[PDB]
Amino acid sequence: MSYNYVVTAQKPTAVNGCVTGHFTSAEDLNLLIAKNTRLEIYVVTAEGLRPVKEVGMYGKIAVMELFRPKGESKDLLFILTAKYNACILEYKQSGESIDIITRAHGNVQDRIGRPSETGIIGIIDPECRMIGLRLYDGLFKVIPLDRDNKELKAFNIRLEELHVIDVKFLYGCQAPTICFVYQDPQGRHVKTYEVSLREKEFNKGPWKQENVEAEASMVIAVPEPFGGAIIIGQESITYHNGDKYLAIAPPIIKQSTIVCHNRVDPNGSRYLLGDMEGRLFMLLLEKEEQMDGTVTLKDLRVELLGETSIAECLTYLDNGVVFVGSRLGDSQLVKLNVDSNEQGSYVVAMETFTNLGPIVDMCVVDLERQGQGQLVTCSGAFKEGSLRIIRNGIGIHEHASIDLPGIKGLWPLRSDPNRETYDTLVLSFVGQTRVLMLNGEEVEETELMGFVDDQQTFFCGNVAHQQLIQITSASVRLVSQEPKALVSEWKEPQAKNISVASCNSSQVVVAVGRALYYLQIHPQELRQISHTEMEHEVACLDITPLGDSNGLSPLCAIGLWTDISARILKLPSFELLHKEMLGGEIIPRSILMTTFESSHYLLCALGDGALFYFGLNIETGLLSDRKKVTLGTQPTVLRTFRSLSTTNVFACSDRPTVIYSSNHKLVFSNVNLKEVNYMCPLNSDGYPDSLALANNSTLTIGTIDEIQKLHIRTVPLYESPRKICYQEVSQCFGVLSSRIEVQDTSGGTTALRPSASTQALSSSVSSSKLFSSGEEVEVHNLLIIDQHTFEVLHAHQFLQNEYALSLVSCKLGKDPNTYFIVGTAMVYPEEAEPKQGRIVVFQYSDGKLQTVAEKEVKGAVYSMVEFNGKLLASINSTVRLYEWTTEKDVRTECNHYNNIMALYLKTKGDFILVGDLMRSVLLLAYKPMEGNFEEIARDFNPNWMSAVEILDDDNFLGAENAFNLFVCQKDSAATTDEERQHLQEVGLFHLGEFVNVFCHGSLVMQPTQGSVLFGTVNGMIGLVTSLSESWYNLLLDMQNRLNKVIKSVGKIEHSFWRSFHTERKTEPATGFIDGDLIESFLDISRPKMQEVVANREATADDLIKVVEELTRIH
C-alpha cells in the first residue's frame, strides 16, 4: 500500500574523477569530469573552460578513460559503471546538435568473485590492444580491442595474487605487460605479467619481483623515453625498470598520504601529486642524454608547490593551469607559477567551484522570516569544512516602497542629455499620467512642460537631440529637455486612437488596429515613413537594434489577434516575411527579441499564462526550438534590463520568472516575489544599478540576486562540522566540529591552521573534574553561530579526548529555557568500545554560553532525542530516559534501561521510536506500566543503515550502505503476536547515493502529500513525497512507456539501474518513482512525446501539464 516519489533537488556537486584529452575533435583539448552518474564535457580554451555537453547515465561512473585505437579520428571514451555496465562511447557533432553514440557495450559482472578492496580498477594498454579490469579478488578480466566485439565479450585469467593494491600496464613493452603491487604476509611487492590474449595465460613478466614499502599504494607507468614504473608510498617514492632501482625518501612527504597524480609533460618528466591535506607537489625526473645512447633517469626530485583543496582529481590542462577535482571541498582552477609569490606559494587559485562536499548533517529553517524553506548544511571535512545555506529562487532586497494602486505601465527617465543617473519616473494609469522626480531617496510628483496627464501613456523613454518621447494613446508626441518644448506632434489621419506601441531610442512603430504607421525622430520632428494594414488586429509588437546598428531596428516581431500568430517583418517596408501560427485562440500578450551571445532569441507570451520560445537570425529567420513552457496563469509581460556581464529577459506575471542562459541554453528561476506586472531597469542617483517593479498597488526598487535556480551561501569553517541544531528563541545555530591538532615540543597539541573554533569571537573550555580514568589529536568543540551574520559567536572546547557525537536543542520537563544538549564519549589510546562519556547541558542566555548541568554516563552517547519531556539517549548499546529535575539535574532510574545500540534514532509526536541496533530497523513504543520501551515491531533482513525516517505512523523510510532506499510498513493482519512483530518492506529503490540525513521540510511554499529532504555524501539533495493510487500507477505507466522512447547513453536499462541491489539479493524497484525520469518527459521532441501517451483522458497537452505540477514540488 506504498506509493513514493523521488526527485533530485540538487545534482551531485562532488567530483569523483576527471580525465583530459582530445575527444571532441583531434584539434581540441577537453576536460572530462565525472560526477556519480554524470559526465561533464569541457573544451579547454584561452579564457578558461567552455562547456559543450552534459550527459546522464543509468549508473555510477567508476572508470573513465579516453583512448585512440589505431586508425581513429579522435579519442574514444571508456566508461565502466559501478553495477558492472561497460561501454565505449563516441562524440559525434554531426548535427548542429550533439551526440554521445555507443560504439560498443555489454555487462561485465561475474557470478563469481568478491569485490576487491581498493575497488574496481580499469586500465588500458598503450597499444590500445586491450582493456584490463580488476573487479574482484583472484580474477583479472580481459577485453580484446579489435574493431568488432561490439558487446565486449571478455575473458578472465586466474590471478594467483589474492590481494591487489594497484595496477597499470607498462609502456615500451613488446607485449601487453601488467605491473602491480600486491599484499601478502611478508608485506607488499611489485610484480609483472605478460598478457597472452592468444591463449589467455599470464606467462612470465619482463622483470622479476621486488619488495616495496609497507604502504606502497600508487603505481605510475612512465612513457617510452624512460619507461618503467614509479611507486609512491609513505615516506618513499621509487622508480623501477628492469634491474634499475631508484629511490627517494623526502621527509616533506612523510606526513599526509599521497592520494592522486597526473602527468604534466608527455615525456613524463613532471607529475603533479595530491595530499590528503591539500598539499600539491611536483615530481621531477631528471634526464641523461648519453653521447649517443637514448635518455635515462639519473634521479627523482619532489617540490612542494603549495596547497589546493583535498583533491580526488588533478588535471594539468595547459599553460600552467591545473583543474583540481575535489570531493571533500570546492573544486577549482589553479595556476601554477614559476616564481613563488607571497606566502612562498607557487600555486595561485584562479577559480573556485561550489561543492556541497559530503553533506554530513542538515536542517531546514525559515531563515529570513518568510514562509519559505531554506536549507543549512554541514559540508566538507577538515580544513574544507563549512556551512552552506541553500535558498530557492532568485530574490530582491527592497530600498523604497510607495503605494499607488492600479498602475498599468512604467518607463525610466534621465533628466539630462549626458548622465545615466535617471532622476524621473512616470506611471501610466487607466486614463491618466502623473510624473515624479528623484532628489536621491525622495519621490516628489509634478509634471513637465508638454506631458499629457489626462492621457494613458504606452511609452516614456528617450530619443535624440536632448529629447523625451511620449507615445500616449491620444498622439505620439515630442518634448525636448533644454528647449523644454513640444518640438512635434503626430496624430492619426482619422482621429482614431492608437493601440500597440514599439519604441527603441531612434525609431518608432505604432499600430492603430490592423493598421501600422512607421514614423521617425530625425532632427527635431516627426516623419511618416510607412503604412501597411495587417490581416487581423495587432496584439503586440517589438523593435530594438539587434547588433549591426545602434538605433535603427532592421526587423520586427508581431503578435496578431485572430489567427493567434507571431511574425517577422522588414521595417522600412513592413513586408510580410515569415509568420508562425500557434495553437489555440488566447491572445499573445507580449513579444520580445533580445541580443544574448550566440543564439539571437525571440519569444511570445500569451494570456492564459503560456509562453513559447524561438531563436532566429537577426539577418533572416529560421523557426527554432519549440517547447511550450508555462509560467503564471496571468498574461506574462516580457522585458529587458541590465545586470552583470550578460543581461536578461524578465517574465512579469503572477509567477515572476527570470530567463537566463544555461549551457548556452536559458535559465528558469522563480523570483521570490508576490507578483509583478510591469518591471523596468535602472541606474539612478538615488538607486544605481537596480530595477523597478509594480504589483497590485505597490511600487518597488532593488537589486537582483545571483543567477541560479538554487542560490548558495558559503561559510568557511576551516575545520570539520559534524552536527547542527537551530535554536529559534536564541536566533542562532549550534554546531559540533572537530579539528586536528598535532604533537609539539611540549608533547601537547598545537594546530595546523586557524579555524572556526580558534578564531571565535568568544570561547571557553571544559573544566569538569568528572574524570580520573609525532601523533594526531582531535579537539571537538561546540560552536554558536548567529543565524543572521553567521559569525562564530562562541566556541566551547570539550575535555581532552572527549568526542562529541550528538547534539539537540530543546526544553525539558517544566523548565521554560531551551538548552543545547550534547552527547559525548571519552576516547582513549586503544580501548575499542569506550566506557565513558557525558551528557552536557548548555545555556546560551543573553550573551554567553552557560554550562548548566553535566551527568556522567558509562559509554559513548551515539544519539539522543527529546521524547515527551525527558531526554532519551542511546549510550553504547543501552537506551535510557532522563529526567530534568526542578533543581536542574538530569537523572534516570538505572533499572529502566534497554538492550539497543541506536546508531540512528527518530520519534513520532506520539510514544513511538525508529531505532537501528544490529543492522536492523526497529519499532518501539513507551509502556508507562514498565517505565520502558516496548518492541512493537522489527525488520529482519540485514541492513547496514546510514540514515532513517518516520513518514507517518506506520511507514518508515531507510537508507543503506549499498545506495538503496527502502520503506518499511507494519502488518495489518491477525497473529498480532508474530506476523505483527515483522514490519515489511513495501518499497525498494536503488538511489545511487549515500544518504547521511533526512529531514521534514520543503524549499517550495510561499497534488501530493508530505515532503522529506535528504543530503548525500556527493552533495546531492533529494526529496521524497507520498502519492496516491492513481498517480503511482499513472506514473509507473509513464515510466515503462518512457524507457521505450528515451535514449540511454551506454545502452543501459533504467530498470537494471534503479533495481535494489545488495550482496544478498537483487529485486526490482517497488513503491517508488524517480521524478528525475518523469521530468524528462518535458525534455522530448513532440514526435516521441505522442508515442508515449498513446492513451482517464489521454493527451500530451493533458500530461505536459501533469509533470509541471511536480516540477513545482521543489
Partner: peptide, 14 residues
Amino acid sequence: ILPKVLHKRTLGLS
C-alpha cells in the same frame, strides 16, 4: 573504534 569509523563512513568511507 566505532565512532571514528562512523565519522569516516559519513565522509565517504575514508
